[PDB]
């Protein structure tokens with residue numbers, strides 16, 4: 001009669017909360033999805049060993065089209081767990097799954113976990129200064145989406161930071177790098193000439209948030225464009241005007257050039 | 266030797282990540298602060314029990330004025346952990362403490378935990394649609410804070426949702442309720458008259474996020490201002506232009522007036 005949405009956290013199998021682990025361990029069945037994002041620091045095998053339950057992976061279609069036929073049925077007479085990377089419900093489509101639960105006479109509870117949305121605080125940028133968020137999607141064929149460019153412009157205009165999720169291909173397990181995202185943004189700038197993203201733009205890169213050794217780098221595009229930030233996942237951020245405290249953190253902790261103390265404050 | 270910033274999560278001792286727990290258990294000294302936020306589901310005793318160590322609680326002054334005198338000295342010869350509610354570097358000024366660690370020659374690492382910043386995903390509102398965040402501070406003396414009102418205005422004009430952290434006076438055990446936050450906003454509205462927050466404004470209240478049965482309510486200010494949302498902590502959210510799937514969730518899960526389903530495109 002109970003369905004539990006449990007977050008797995010940021011990077012590896014230990015990023016689940018103690019609450020999520022204990023509850024998952026006592027569930028009769030455990031489902032999981034890895035299409036909204038992936039856990040680069042671990043494997044399905046390692047997660048299974050930690051939980052002590054077999055985990056049935058579900059595809060985007062399994063969830064969006066058949067959540068009520070694959071998961072909810074067992075949720076009727078058993079305790080079921082649905083694992084997702086990060087914090088449950090951050091992915092836009094997940095929220096409505098709770099309505100499906102209600103429609104089927106099934107109770108649902110949410111067990112939170114660290115999300116990259118809040119983990120970016122490790123960059124030293126004030127969380128309240130983050131505006132609208134966006135995703136840099138890979139251009140494919142004749143399709144060249146650039147809405148994420150406008151989000152940066154509107155946020156920056158108001159002195160707000162812009163969090164950019166990088167496109168993933170759960171398919172080939174392909175991760176878009178910050179380097180690729182920057183190249184894309186330079187192309188869009190050249191296309192829209194809005195003075196929103198150039199070689200002189202200050203940028204922050206956060207790689208492998210959640211691990212004990214994430215890469216936190218800050219600097220101008222011209223210098224970071226071809227820098228190696230390590231293995232995925234990569235997160236890109238375009239800061240708005242900085243508060244002195246933010247700049248000093250980026251310089252002392254993220255290796256930003258002293259120049260940002262007089263150019264971006 | 267090293268210093269660890271470890272988040273404890275949203276509500277109880279089990280909201281800490283497994284990573285944070287295994288690391289806390291192995292530290293020689295453990296410090297913590299409980300003034301930036303409040304965990305209404307546990308006690309210092311329960312936290313100490315789970316971690317198996319004595320926790321020295323620090324006040325705002327201990328941290329803000331003597332962090333490098335009380336904590337950092339031990340981090341040079343031992344493995345030290347500093348615990349905080351939610352995520353350690355979210356809606357706090359703890360990031361600056363990492364700079365103090367560097368200058369004292371102490372390597373620091375951050376262990377994230379579920380944060381209210383992302384937990385609001387449980388309200389059904391798309392996380393990417395949240396704009397700048399703000400805090401509703403208790404008016405003191407002849408000083409009446411009102412910046413948070415402008416934040417809502419600015420976000421709303423862009424169709425973005427606004428997350429309003431509510432004030433807290435830990436030493437005086439005062440936790441601002443959504444009702445008090447709504448009252449203050451109506452007053453600011455009377456003064457500025459920007460039509461930003463009125464009796465007809467739709468709002469969302471989230472109480473005790475992280476517990477298994479949080480209170481999630483949506484409705485007009487006139488109907489919610491005197492409603493009982495249970496014990497604190499509380500967060501207040503002023504939605505912007507709603508997507509149809511967001512409205513359905515507010516209605517189905519948060520008991521909002523069915524009329525909001527009729528979105529004005």
Ligand SMILES: Nc1ncnc2c1ncn2[C@@H]1O[C@H](CSCC[C@H](N)C(=O)O)[C@@H](O)[C@H]1O
Pocket residue numbers: 275276301302303350351352353354355356357379380381382429430431432433471472473474475498499500
């Ligand atoms: N479980 C919870 N439910 C509702 N509001 C919460 C909450 N935890 C924190 N808050 C809100 O946030 C304020 C503290 S701000 C500090 C937040 C913390 N770093 C985090 O990551 O969550 C509180 O006064 C309250 O308004």
